[PDB]
Amino acid sequence: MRECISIHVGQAGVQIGNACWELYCLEHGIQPDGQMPSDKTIGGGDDSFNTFFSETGAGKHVPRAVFVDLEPTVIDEVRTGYRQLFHPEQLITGKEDAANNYARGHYTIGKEIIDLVLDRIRKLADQCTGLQGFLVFHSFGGGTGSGFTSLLMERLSVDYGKKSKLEFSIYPAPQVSTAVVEPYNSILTTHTTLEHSDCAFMVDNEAIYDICRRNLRPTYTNLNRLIGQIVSSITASLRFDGALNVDLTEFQTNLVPYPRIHFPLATYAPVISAQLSVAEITNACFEPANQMVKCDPRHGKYMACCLLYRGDVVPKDVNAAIATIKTKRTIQFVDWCPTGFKVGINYQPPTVVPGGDLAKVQRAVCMLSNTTAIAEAWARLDHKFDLMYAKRAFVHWYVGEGMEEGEFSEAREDMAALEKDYEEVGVD
Amino acid sequence: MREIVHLQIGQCGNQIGAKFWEVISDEHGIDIAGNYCGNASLQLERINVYFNEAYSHKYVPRSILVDLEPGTMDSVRSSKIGPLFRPDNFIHGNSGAGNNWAKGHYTEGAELIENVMDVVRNECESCDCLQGFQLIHSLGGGTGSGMGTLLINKIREEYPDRIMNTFSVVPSPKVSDTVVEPYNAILSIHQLIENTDETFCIDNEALYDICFRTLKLTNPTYGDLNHLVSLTMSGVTTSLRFPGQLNADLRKLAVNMVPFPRLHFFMPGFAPLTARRALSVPELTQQMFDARNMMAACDPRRGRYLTVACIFRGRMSTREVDEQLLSVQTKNSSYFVEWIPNNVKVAVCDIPPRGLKMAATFIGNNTAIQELFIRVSEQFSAMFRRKAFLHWYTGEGMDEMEFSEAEGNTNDLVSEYQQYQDATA
Ligand SMILES: COc1ccc(C[C@@H]2NC(=O)/C=C/C[C@@H]([C@H](C)[C@H]3O[C@@H]3c3ccccc3)OC(=O)[C@H](CC(C)C)OC(=O)C(C)(C)CNC2=O)cc1Cl
Ligand SMILES: Nc1nc2c(ncn2[C@@H]2O[C@H](COP(=O)(O)OP(=O)(O)OP(=O)(O)O)[C@@H](O)[C@H]2O)c(=O)[nH]1
Ligand SMILES: Nc1nc2c(ncn2[C@@H]2O[C@H](COP(=O)(O)OP(=O)(O)O)[C@@H](O)[C@H]2O)c(=O)[nH]1
C-alpha cells in the first residue's frame, strides 16, 4: 500500500546504494538473482518489504532503485559485479562528469540529462500507487552529487510538492578528499537543497574512518560496508514490522520541528572485530567519539531521540538503561515538552556480510537523535568557505558554467541565517 | 573511457614524446606490435585515453607528431617505437623555421595549420567523447613555440569547452646557444596566459642543474634530459593512466590545482631521479619538496604552495605516507597558503615505473614560478632594449607593439603573483 523510490546520485551514492541493496537482499533473505525462497509462495506485495521491493510478472523482486551518475564506470560495475537484479532501463548513466563543480552539475551538464531522469522517475512512480516519497543518496563534496542533486531536488519540489523527500548526504572529510572545492560544493548544495529536503542524515567519512581505525588506512570498501550497515540499521524499521518510524512522515515528525533544522545524528555502539550488556551499549550511543558526525553534543541541547534496538534485546532492561542514562547530567534537553528516548525494538537480528568487516552480534542499537551540535560542523564548513572567498579563490570555475558571483554571497547569507537559527534554538 | 588526443610540436616535443611513449608502453605492457603482454589487469584498464584500439588487438597511440623538417620524422621512424605509431598521423613540413617564432606563427604554421586542423577534426569526429588535448612542445624553438601557440588558438576557437594541457619547456641559456629564445618564450608565455588553462613548466635550466649536481654528469646531453622529462611525465600521468582515489582526469586536475585563470603554471618534480639504492617513505618525502629536486628553476622557500598533488608509485604503506606528509605539512606550515585548506592531495598507485621500485611525483602551483617569469622577462629586457634580431620578426608582419604587449602581460602576471603571495589569511 506504500512504496519508496531510492535515488542514488554520484559515485558515492551509487556505491552506497549498491552496498545497501546487497545488505537488504541479505537481511530479507532475497536471493541475488531476484527470487525469494519463502515469501514467493504468496506471489504478491504488502509483505512488509513492498515499500522497497517490487515484484514483476516473473516473480523477481527487483528493488525500486534509480542509479544516476554522470560517469558510467560505477554503473557498469553494478551491471557486471546484480545484473539480473537491477533492470538496465532504470540505471541512468552520463557522458561527462561535473568534476568537483557544483555549477557544472547544476546548469550545463546536469541540465542536458535532467529530463531523462525525470521521465525515468515518473515511469517508476507510475508502478507505485501509494508511494510515500524518495530517498536521495548523494555526497556533498562531488560535482554530480551536489549539482545534479540540487537540480533534482528543485524539479521534485516543483513537480511532487505533496510528497516528502529524505536526504542521505556524505559530509566531506580531510582524510579522504579528492577535491579542494568541497566546501564550495557543500555550501552551495546546502543552500539550494535547504527548502527541498526534510531529513538529511549527513555522515562524514572521518568518523567512519576513525571507527574503522580504532575498532576494526582502511579503504573505500570497508567504509562502504560500514556505511551500508549504518544506513541498513537506520532504515531497518521501514522494511520490517511496525513499531515506530515506519514512514517518511514519521521520520519528519519524530525528529524535525523546523522547516530548516532537519539534520539528525546517528550513533552506533556495537562495532567489534570480525558479549556486551544493554546498559553499556546504550551508554556508548551517547559517546561523542562514536557518533557519525565529528561533533560534541554536550555543548548543545537535544531535541529528540529515537532509539532503535536490533536483535534479541529484552524490553525490560531498556528502561533501566534509560534511567541510568537520564541520571547523568550530560544530557540537557530543550524546555518545550522534550519527551525522551522513544524506544522501538525489532526482534529480527541484523545480518552481517559473511567474512566481511563487522562480526555478527546479538545486541544492536542506534540513536537517531537531533541536536544543535551540527552547528559546529556547519561553522567549520563556513569557515573553510570564508577562507577561500576572501581572495575569491576558485571562483571562475563556477561562473564559467552559467552561475553568478552573487550566488556565493547568497549561500553565505543562507548559512549565516542557519547558524543564527541554530544559535537561537540553542539560546533560551 | 574518455579519449585524449596527443599533440607533439617541434623536434624537442617529438624526441621527448617518443621517449615518453616508450616509457609508457614499457609500463603498460604494450609491445611494438600493439598487443597487450602485461601481467596486471590495471594496465589494460584506462588504456583508451592514450592508445587507440585498432583491429586484431593493436593498441596504437593517438599521437599527432607535428614538425617542419622530415629529419625528425625519419629519426622517429628509425627508433623502436616507429612502427608502433600511426603512420597516417605523421605531419611534416619542408623547411624548418629555425628559431624563428614569427615564421612558425604567421607564415609556415599558418600554412600547415589547415592540415593539422583537418587531422585534429578527423580524430575528434571519431571520438565518443573528447576529454582534452595534451600538448608537448618547447617555448624557445621556431616551429615548436609558434606552431604550438597557433594550434592552441585554433583548438580554443574550435572547442571552447575542452581543456588544454601543455608541457611547455622554457628555454635556458645553459643548454641552448641561440640568443633569440627570450623573444619566443615571452611571446608564447603571453599566448599561453590568454588561451590555455594548464601549463607544466618544465625548465631545462633546472634539468641541467639536476644532471650537474645530483647525477654528477658535467655534459648536459639531450638523451639524459629526455629520459628525466619522460620519467617525470610518466609519474605525472600515472593519475590519468590508472584508476584511483585521485583520478585527476584533466578537468579534475584543473579544478583542484588552478585557482585563477592566469596563475595556472605548475611545477612538476621527481624525487627518485637516477641516470641510466634504498627507497623508503620519509626520504622520498624529504626529497619531494627539495629545491634541488624540482624541475623548474625556482626557490620554494621564497614562495607559497597554492596546491600540491603528490602522487606515490610502488608498493608502500599508505598510512606511513599520510603520516609523513602530514608531518611535512605541519612542520612547514609557513610554506603553504593558509587561506586554501587541505591543499595536499595524496594518491598511491601500486604499479611502479620500470627500473624503479618506488616513485614519488609532485605537481604544484607554487608562487616560486614567478622567479622563472622574472628571469625570462629580464633576459627579454636585455634583448629588447637594444632591438637585437628585431628585423627578422618585424619583417613578417609582426608589430613591434606585440613585444611590448607580451612584456606588459608577463609583468602583470608577476605583479599579480606577488600581490597574491603578500596576502595572508
Ligand atoms: C649579439 O651578437 C651575437 C651573439 C651570438 C650569436 C649566436 C648565433 N646566432 C643566433 O643565435 C641567431 C639566431 C637568430 C635566428 C634567426 C632569427 C632565424 O629567423 C632566421 C631564419 C633562419 C632560417 C630560415 C628562415 C629564417 O637564426 C637562427 O636561428 C639560425 C638558423 C639558420 C642558420 C638555419 O641558426 C643559428 O643561428 C645557428 C647557426 C644554429 C647558431 N647561431 C648562433 O649561435 C649571434 C650574434 Cl649576432
Ligand atoms: N564513504 C564514501 N565516500 C565516498 C565514496 N566515493 C566518493 N565518496 C566521497 O566523495 C567525495 C568526493 O566526491 P567525488 O570524488 O567527486 O565523487 P562524487 O561525490 O560521486 O561526485 P562525482 O564524481 O562527480 O560523481 C569524497 O569526499 C568522498 O568522501 C565512497 O565510496 N564511500
Ligand atoms: N630538455 C630538452 N630540451 C630540448 C631538447 N631538444 C631541444 N630542446 C630545447 O628546445 C629548444 C629548441 O626548439 P626546437 O624543437 O629545436 O624548435 P624547432 O627547431 O623550430 O623545431 C632549445 O631551446 C632547447 O633548449 C631535448 O632533447 N631535451
Numbering used by the authors:
A (entry chain U): 1 to 81, 83 to 217, 221 to 278, 285 to 438
B (entry chain R): 1 to 276, 282 to 430
Question: What's the paper's own text on this?
Answer:
An unusual case of monoisotypic tubulin that is naturally occurring is the blood cell-specific tubulin purified from the marginal band MTs of chicken erythrocytes (ChET). This tubulin preparation comprises isotypes α1 and β1, corresponding to the genes TUBA1 and TUBB1 from Gallus gallus, which are orthologs of TUBA1A and TUBB1 from humans.
The best 3D class was refined by nonuniform refinement, resulting in cryo-EM density maps with resolution FSC0.143 = 3.2 Å for the C8 ring and 3.5 Å for the C9 ring, respectively. The Cp-52 tubulin rings are also comparatively less polydisperse than other tubulin samples used for solving cryo-EM structures of tubulin since only two ring species are observed, having 8 or 9 αβ-tubulin heterodimers, which are easily separated using 2D classification. At 0.5 to 3 μM Cp-52, the main species detected for both ChET and HeLaT are the C8 and C9 rings in the 700 to 900 kDa range.
